[PDB]
Amino acid sequence: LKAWHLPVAPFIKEQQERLMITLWLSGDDLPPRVTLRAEEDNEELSLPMHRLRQAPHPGVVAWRGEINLVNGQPRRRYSFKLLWADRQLWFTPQEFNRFPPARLEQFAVDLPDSGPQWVADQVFYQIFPDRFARSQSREAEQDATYYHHAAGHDIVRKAWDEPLTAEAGGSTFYGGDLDGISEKLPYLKQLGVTALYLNPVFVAPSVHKYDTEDYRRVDPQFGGDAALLRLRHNTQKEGMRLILDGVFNHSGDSHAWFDRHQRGSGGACHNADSPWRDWYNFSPEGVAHDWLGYASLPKLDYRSSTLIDEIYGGEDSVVRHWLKAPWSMDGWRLDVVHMLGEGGGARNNLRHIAGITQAAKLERPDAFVFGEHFGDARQWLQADVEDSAMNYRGFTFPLWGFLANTDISYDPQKIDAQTCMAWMDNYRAGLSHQQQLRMFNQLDSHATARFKSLLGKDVARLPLAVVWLFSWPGVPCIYYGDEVGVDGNNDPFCRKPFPWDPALQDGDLLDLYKRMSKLRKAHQALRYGGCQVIYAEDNVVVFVRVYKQQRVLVAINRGEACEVVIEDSPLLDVNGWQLKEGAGALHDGVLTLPAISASVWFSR
Amino acid sequence: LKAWHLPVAPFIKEQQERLMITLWLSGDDLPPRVTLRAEEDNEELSLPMHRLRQAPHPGVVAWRGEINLVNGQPRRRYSFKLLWADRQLWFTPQEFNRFPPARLEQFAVDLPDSGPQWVADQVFYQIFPDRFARSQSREAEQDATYYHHAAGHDIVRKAWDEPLTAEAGGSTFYGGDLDGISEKLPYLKQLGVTALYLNPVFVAPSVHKYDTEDYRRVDPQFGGDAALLRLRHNTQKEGMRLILDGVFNHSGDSHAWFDRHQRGSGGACHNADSPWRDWYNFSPEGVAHDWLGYASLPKLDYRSSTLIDEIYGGEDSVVRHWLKAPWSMDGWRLDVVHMLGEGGGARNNLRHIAGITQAAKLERPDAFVFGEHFGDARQWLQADVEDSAMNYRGFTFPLWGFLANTDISYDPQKIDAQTCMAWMDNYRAGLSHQQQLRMFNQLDSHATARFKSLLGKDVARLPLAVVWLFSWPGVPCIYYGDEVGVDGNNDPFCRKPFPWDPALQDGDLLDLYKRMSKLRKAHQALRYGGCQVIYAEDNVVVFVRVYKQQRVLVAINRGEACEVVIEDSPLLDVNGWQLKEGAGALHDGVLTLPAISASVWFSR
Ligand SMILES: C[C@H]1O[C@H](O[C@H]2[C@H](O)[C@@H](O)[C@@H](O[C@@H]3[C@H](O)[C@@H](O)[C@H](O)O[C@@H]3CO)O[C@@H]2CO)[C@H](O)[C@@H](O)[C@H]1N[C@H]1C=C(CO)[C@@H](O)[C@H](O)[C@H]1O
Ligand SMILES: C[C@H]1O[C@H](O[C@H]2[C@H](O)[C@@H](O)[C@@H](O[C@@H]3[C@H](O)[C@@H](O)[C@H](O)O[C@@H]3CO)O[C@@H]2CO)[C@H](O)[C@@H](O)[C@H]1N[C@H]1C=C(CO)[C@@H](O)[C@H](O)[C@H]1O
DSSP states (O other), X not given: OEEEOOSSTTSEEEETTEEEEEEEEESSSOOSEEEEEEEETTEEXXXXXXXXXXXXXXXXXXXXXXXXXXXXXXXXXXXXXEEOSSOEXXXXXXXXXXXXXXXXXXXXXXXXXXXXXXXXXXOEEEEOGGGTOOOTTOOGGGGOOOEETTTTXXXXXXXXXXXXXXXXXXXXXXXXXXXXXXXXXXXXXXHTOOEEEEOOOEEOSSSSOOSOSEEEEEOGGGTHHHHHHHHHHHXXXXXOEEEEEEOOSBOOTTSTTTOTTOSSSOOSSSOTTOTTGGGXXXXXXXXXXXXXXXXXXXXXXXXXXXXXXXXXXXXXOHHHHTTSTTXXXXXXXXXXXXXXXXXXXXBTHHHHHHHHHHHHHHHOTTOEEEEEESSOOHHHHHTTSSXXXXXXXXXXXXXXXXXXXXXXXXXXXXXXXXXXXXXXXXXXXXXXXXXXXXXXXXXXXXXSOOHHHHHXXXXXXXXXXXXXXXXXXXXXXXXXXXXXXXXXXXXXXTOOOOOOSGGGSOHHHHHHHHHHHHHHHHOTHHHHOEEEEEEEETTEEEEEEEETTEEEEEEEEOSSOEEEEOOOOGGGOSSOEEEEESSOEEETTEEEEOSSEEEEEEEO | OEEEOOSSTTSEEEETTEEEEEEEEESSSOOSEEEEEEEETTXXXXXXXXXXXXXXXXXXXXXXXXXXXXXSOSEEEEEEEEEOSXXXXXXXXXXXXXXXXXXXXSEEEESSOOSOTTGGGOOEEEXXXXXXXXXXXXXXXXXXXXXXXXXXXXXXXXXXXXXXXXXXXXXXXXXXXXXXXXXXXXXXXHHTOOEEEEOOOEEOSXXXXXXXXXXXXXXGGGTHHHHHHHHHHHHHHTTOEEEEEEOOSBOOTTSTXXXXXXXXXXXSSSOTTOTTGGGSOBOTTOOBOOBTTBSSSOBOBTTOHHHHIIXXXXXXXXXXXXXXXXXXXXXXXXXXXXXXXXXXXXXXXXXXXXXXXXXXXXXXXXXXXXXXXXXXXXXXXHTTSSSEEEEIIIIIHHHHHHHHSOOTTOXXXXXXXXXXXXXXXXXXXXXXXXXXXXXXXXXXXXXXOOXXXXXXXXXXXXXXXXHHHHXXXXXXXXXXXXXXXXXXXXXXXXXXXOOOSGGGSOHHHHHHHHHHHHHHHHOTHHHHOEEEEEEEETTEEEEEEEETTEEEEEEXXXXXXXXXXXXXXXXXXXXXXXXXXXXXXXETTEEEEOSSEEEEEEEO
16 A cells, blocks of 8 residues: 655645645545544544546546635644554654654644744855954954953964964854855855854854854844944845854853953842842852853843743744844744753743743744754654744754764764655654744854764765755855865854865865755745655665655765665656756666665656 | 553652652663753753662663752653663653653652642532522422523423423423432442532523523522532532632623623613623624624623632632632532633633632642533643533543444444543643643533443443543542442433432442442542553553552453453562452462453552
């Protein structure tokens, strides 16, 4: 028995107040009855399906039923209950199940969809501002050294060509700034970038600036408020989106609310009468607690109602401040989204993350709010407390395992294509189709080793991850310099200054990024399409994006040259295929795949 | 490779502010390193494990690590990361995983546990009051007929021996009352019952009374307030718990807040100025909406702040009213728990169910709050918005499939022991050990066909479900009359009057219930123990409850006589076994199991 269904046209279609659901079956012992098991206000419904007279494809039988859209919540969950005289079988995002699937692992479609629909149309680029580009006209005022109290020494200035070292990793400045990003927008635009995610830019003593000192003012070293306001103008003018790093789990210990180094008068660290005393945790004798290992990053206590108001509760809150005029940013990347909470830990985390996302959409209804999840984000996404997550668990780490033999802990990993796709497909199963389309996918970040370094001897697999990055469901994010071949180990060495000298750039890898963003811009199924893994064994993964009549076929081979027979899939029943990238060859259901390759085909 | 771990002593042990975690491995290619992958404030931690010098059992290697209890939230989630030089493997509640388990499918232990710890010590009995027992001294005033407006005719009185029929299914009264329950407490106590769950008892015109007319007054037909207050006294006196049906998704249309039949003056159905107009949904022209198919059961709209206060928000709320003096009930069974919400559907359902549970524990900290979930309750339980659920998905329906060949929809079901246990074990995987211990397990209810009827030709399998009911993790609930062999199809025919004539009672089945409640009372592992399925194939399931040094082995065979070899399991390495129930025989790792049997062994 075989079955096909994707939560997307041609398999679903909205018409009047109805959502039409089609299932495809094929086999010798087809079920005489199929029931669409859908959910309406969390109640399980048995919706009858009827057999369509016309075969959608040779030897395939189509069933159709419908979900009433006038009732129920927007997230339409369903699966298929295949019924014979004596038995049943479930068809799910994870193929066949012999017992009922988990409610939160069904197919799901958001109708109506209230999420940020612009996200799926984007190509993202992550910039660590100190290390991206120095503006042509920066004051040496922005080059001045000061004493970094939390570190115990003066900050260090380095020149763009000086080697990055482990010493003073948080206090070494190469001087990149926001005007530098503005001036490099034409580079970013010819890369295909339509959206920027910036690491923190607010006033802070370290170079990374997660040690926030002032949530209301841009750090002068980056050019201050005027330079970010210009970056807002320039990106708007170029139709680009701009997301800022939201660091709300914790402040820096130089913030005026805490003020450990007593720059001012009212800080909570050394004053029991401080207005912000209840925004931080203290020992019974009144000594401020460290957060994890960090004196520099005291944790904010969302037990306090006034803290709740300051961050997201009130109209004057930090979360809404940067979303209205004049800043009008497009949303927030939430740092440490999973640990924010009350009493020094993640207590009531889900309530506060929801409160933040809600406050964002009050100020700006199409605001994009997504959180950094090294871990399993499914509970957050399944309760809709945020729009998306940095998809380390659903995308990054499966590719670390399959291509680079490592994982989140940099432990040995040995997983073949079957395991890799069961992993990636199991993660998506917890997400609606509209959620899958906006998952924030990347290969590395400011908080990981460079993916190119993680490949080691297998660095020739890097072009595979690039193609995969642009073709797996979700919005892709390029970590700055990845595209020109920047490498390095984990923090601090993953934050090398961008090599603007072309002699220091992998020009071929950069072109591959350019072509892939063009393909994604060009073809709807790479932005809106369902996704069916078709073959996943040993070294070879083959999947197809599916949107209406269009198909995009992707074949990734991490190992030696081989041939892979694709059994006649009704998803691949098209007029013909046009190869768009890679040197693979499809002919008569046989994929001839060269060693260590990734190929993309468009249906013609 | 083989592994064992249960979230219970001997595998875990609290000592100082530390939780010690032990894993057992056995095989030819053991991992030289194992990492305890635990969670602290949602952050994934790699806690090293070390090899113990002493083998817990022959050919078994023990690893140990520890979770720091001073930090993190009470729910300690973890799994095991087996590490070799070139690869890794995960050990989980669901055996080995090749890619990381879901965060909410790890092992989990609640330390500290704030749940109702008395629940695991109970045997529950569900009573539909009209059909249980008429008190020796009931007024014929309680026998009077009235007109049931929602039905269109007078209620009907029947005698205890009159056959139950489909006519007037909601308006036919056999006259059982609360004093009748009181007078039958000695029967219930010699059955082993320690706790009662009553279907609704508040003033309502139907016989089932989910059409609530007055949340503050007991229906006179059941004996009114004094009869329930006596039932409170009598159960307290006998050390028994008392749970009431909480019907808060919807009221009856005869309630004064709605008042469709205009008994009074201010109802919301026919008065736009009504104080409760915003507690119900109306068409733009102001006509009250039906809920699902029901005019009689208008849905309550938790959008309204004053409704929130009336039900659970205020100190005078319905939820807290019955939990303080003089009522001092032990908690609430929440009817339609999954659909309660705002605007006519389940919008913000999770917030309101949590609000209800919170209000219960304000009034009464060890209150038990659990909801009727025909569906998958995992999201509710995983967010802790309730203590437990009627475990239809985790217990009832797997036993319907494996023993009775049917399911929630009364569709044909054909599932063997492998599928049945993968199903039951997958559900539990989403639940902490303390949550598993308080899942509300039963074989049928007032809302299903009688399980004995569902077995059909295979009714001889009924004793298997009984033994299973008392030995699978969770608190068992007997649906009244099940124990004496009452049968019948779905509602109305599942609510037959209890046969108090012994000539109409299955005396053997009643004794089996008596013995099983005694075993459960006697042996700690049947109330607190972990649970490891040991064998699950074809007709045979074998599992063991595990608590400290004690073991309870259960072997269920739904089919022909057979022998089952139990490979040497270190969980079964004991001095010897004492057979307590059933005619199975264990000798030298070989189970001789007669046709259609269930057997229980205690370790000696
Ligand atoms: C002092 C450090 O500040 C930053 O790191 C913070 C920040 O809030 C965030 O990046 C957080 O990131 C991750 C997730 O929260 C975890 O889920 C994941 O498992 O681990 C991630 C990173 O650990 O981590 C920090 C809060 O826990 C900044 O990004 C870092 O560079 C930090 N390091 C300082 C200090 C050292 C001293 O040796 C230097 O190596 C480094 O270069 C400095 O910048
Ligand atoms: C009118 C009916 O009132 C009661 O049923 C309600 C009640 O709130 C609750 O039992 C609810 O139960 C279930 C769950 O909510 C669902 O998840 C599950 O899938 O379906 C369950 C039962 O349908 O169902 C009702 C709210 O939807 C009372 O228990 C019933 O007896 C009801 N029936 C009346 C009416 C008919 C007319 O033919 C008679 O057959 C019956 O004997 C009457 O009592």
